[PDB]
Design a protein around this ligand. Structure first.
Ligand code: CL
Lengths: 266, 359
């Protein structure tokens, strides 16, 4: 007869022992540059994610170089060295501690290096830590790093407290494409449609020379019909940003004519 | 606390990234993959998808692959129609597979983030669809590949020596282009193959029935079944074994069932009269493959056994021995040739229960 054996510790032992080899720079065949260089094993990295397989295949320059230069990160001198060390140790051990302050870089490293399970954990970590204080920041990460379940939950929170979100400075940090999407959204709760115009003017004023070009497209997204005709003539029309653009002048002109034609229809 | 730094990517910067990737894809298609940095090409494709420009990268990828396969690959295959067609098509097929692996590797982030989100085909499957539609199923190539593969199988059956490997590579290609399916292989190859095979086996049966005995014919059907299975194992796809064997069975057995069993001085009755045990076993084994096969054998045997039994009950101890000798003879045939089949046992019993009740 034949018997099957399974070493109970072999799985945990192999991972920890290869990680201790890496920390000692023993049997390392690849260098990861983010600056601080991280020596690692090609066999472990290629096993951790599908990303390292073509990088260390031989069909590209990096296999003949022995060193890989990881560039164009959210921060100028790359991510935090301790965070990169945690993500590299994760690729070996499968164990990682993620904090509220490191989650954005762990998610950036996990998403870029196609670490699906680590990206899922970051998404689940931000889901449990989701609140009105960090809803704008969490939505930006979920939209950026494709966390559809988290993006829906964070967006559904902003749509309800949009009147409070547009009051804080955090909303005015958002790039044009996100500002354009929130104005296009119909389920957002606002006390008045006139407040939406006042927030567009406040957003463009934050970076005048860099956000004046976006005012024309954002004004076209505004619901001029829902706003009162008194505010459209005394506050909307005399603005400097609306007076410059000829199409923005015709937009408020057609809006005033639309209010007069609708009032006579009754 | 939780931080986020989303940035707007300038339209001119997206175009420069795409121009770099477009050039890289074109260099991979030209087999000049050496000197290309994977990380920088992955990062460029990553930055495009990350900044929500995945549609431009996907549309662009579809354009560059289509431009290459129509303007370069289709022409190479079209210029080789009468000069090494299968060799040039398989070379174009291997060059496409090699290129698409590297292209899917560079656009790996798009393959896991964009194609999943926007319910569109992945880089490799898109490459297969473009190769399938613009090369393999174009028209002049589709008809010539169908003409080439069928002419080779038609020649091999006539005694000619053909490149079986070239057929296997073409069939493997048609299967993969089915996108984890046999739609392309079935439509382009299998359907006309079964059509031309049925026409060949129909004419094969006509010749064999006109000059060979029932025993030799049965041996020749078994030989044809084996020749067509061996052909599927070395040239075609494994899924063609059942449809080809069914066509062999339809054209050589099913359509000539009453003809084979009632063959004058060689059929079932002749085998029954001369006690040809082995031949009847071979007839049983061959006819058990097709529906109404054993039924035809039973009906032929029943007609003869009843005729013999009626003649036995009509024509003291010698009369009783005659029925016992007839019973012992057919009991031997049932065990030694008809594998003690329930249908044959019921027929032998049923016939005996008819003529023994008659007198
Ligand atoms: Cl007999």
């Amino acid at each position: 007869e034949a018997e099957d054996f399974e070493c109970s510790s072999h799985c945990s032992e192999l991972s920890w022992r290869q990680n201790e080899q890496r920390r000692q720079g023993l049997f390392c065949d690849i260098t990861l540059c983010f600056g601080r260089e991280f020596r690692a094993h090609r066999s472990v990295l290629a096993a951790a994610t599908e990303y390292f397989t073509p990088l260390l295949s031989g069909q590209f320059s990096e296999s003949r170089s022995g060193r890989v230069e990881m560039r164009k990160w959210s921060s100028e001198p790359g991510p935090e060295p301790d965070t990169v060390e945690a993500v590299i140790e994760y690729m070996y051990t499968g164990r990682i501690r993620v904090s509220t302050g490191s989650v954005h870089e762990v998610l950036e490293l996990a998403d870029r290096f196609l670490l699906i399970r680590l990206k899922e954990f970051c998404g689940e970590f931000l889901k449990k830590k989701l609140h009105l204080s960090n809803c704008v920041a969490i939505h930006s990460l979920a939209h950026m790093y494709t966390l559809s379940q988290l993006a829906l939950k964070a967006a559904d929170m902003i749509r309800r407290n949009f009147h409070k979100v547009i009051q804080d400075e955090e909303f005015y940090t958002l790039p044009f494409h996100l500002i354009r999407d929130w104005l296009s959204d119909l389920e957002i709760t606002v006390d008045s449609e006139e407040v939406l115009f006042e927030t567009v003017l406040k957003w463009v004023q934050r970076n005048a020379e860099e956000r004046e070009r976006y005012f024309e497209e954002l004004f076209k997204l505004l619901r001029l019909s829902q706003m009162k005709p008194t505010y459209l003539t005394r506050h909307v029309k005399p603005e400097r940003l609306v007076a410059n653009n000829e199409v923005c002048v015709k937009l408020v002109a057609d809006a005033v004519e639309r209010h007069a034609l609708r009032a006579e229809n009754i | 606390r939780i931080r986020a730094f989303p940035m707007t990517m300038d339209e001119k910067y997206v175009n420069s990234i795409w121009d770099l990737l477009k050039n890289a894809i074109q260099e991979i298609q030209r087999k000049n993959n050496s000197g290309l940095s994977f990380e920088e090409l992955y990062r460029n494709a990553y930055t495009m998808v990350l900044h929500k420009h995945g549609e431009k990268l996907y549309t662009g990828l579809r354009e560059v692959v289509t431009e290459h396969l129509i303007n370069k690959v289709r022409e190479d295959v079209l210029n080789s129609l009468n000069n090494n067609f299968l060799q040039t098509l398989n070379q174009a097929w291997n060059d496409h597979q090699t290129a698409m692996v590297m292209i899917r590797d560079i656009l790996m982030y798009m393959d896991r983030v964009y194609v999943q989100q926007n319910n569109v085909e992945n880089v490799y499957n898109l490459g297969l669809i473009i190769f399938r539609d613009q090369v393999v199923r174009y028209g002049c190539i589709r008809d010539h590949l169908r003409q080439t593969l069928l002419d080779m199988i038609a020649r091999e059956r006539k005694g000619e020596v053909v490149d079986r490997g070239a057929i296997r590579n073409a069939c493997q290609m048609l299967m993969i282009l089915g996108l984890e399916g046999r739609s392309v292989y079935e439509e382009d190859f299998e359907a006309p193959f079964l059509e031309m095979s049925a026409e060949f086996f129909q004419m094969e049966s006509q010749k064999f029935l006109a000059e060979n005995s029932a025993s030799v014919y049965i041996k020749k059907v078994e030989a044809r079944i084996n020749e067509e299975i061996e052909r599927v194992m070395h040239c075609l796809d494994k899924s063609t074994e059942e449809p080809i064997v069914k066509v062999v069975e339809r054209e050589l057995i099913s359509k000539h069932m009453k003809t084979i069993v009632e063959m004058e001085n060689s059929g079932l009755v002749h085998m029954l009269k001369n006690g040809k045990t082995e031949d009847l076993g071979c007839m049983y084994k061959l006819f058990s493959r097709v529906p109404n096969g054993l039924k035809t054998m039973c009906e032929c045997m029943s007609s003869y056994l009843r005729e013999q039994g009626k003649a036995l009950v009509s024509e003291p101890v010698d009369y009783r021995q005659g029925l016992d000798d007839l019973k012992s003879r057919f009991d031997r045939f049932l065990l030694e040739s008809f594998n003690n089949d329930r249908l044959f046992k019921q027929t032998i019993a049923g016939d005996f229960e008819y003529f023994l009740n008659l007198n």
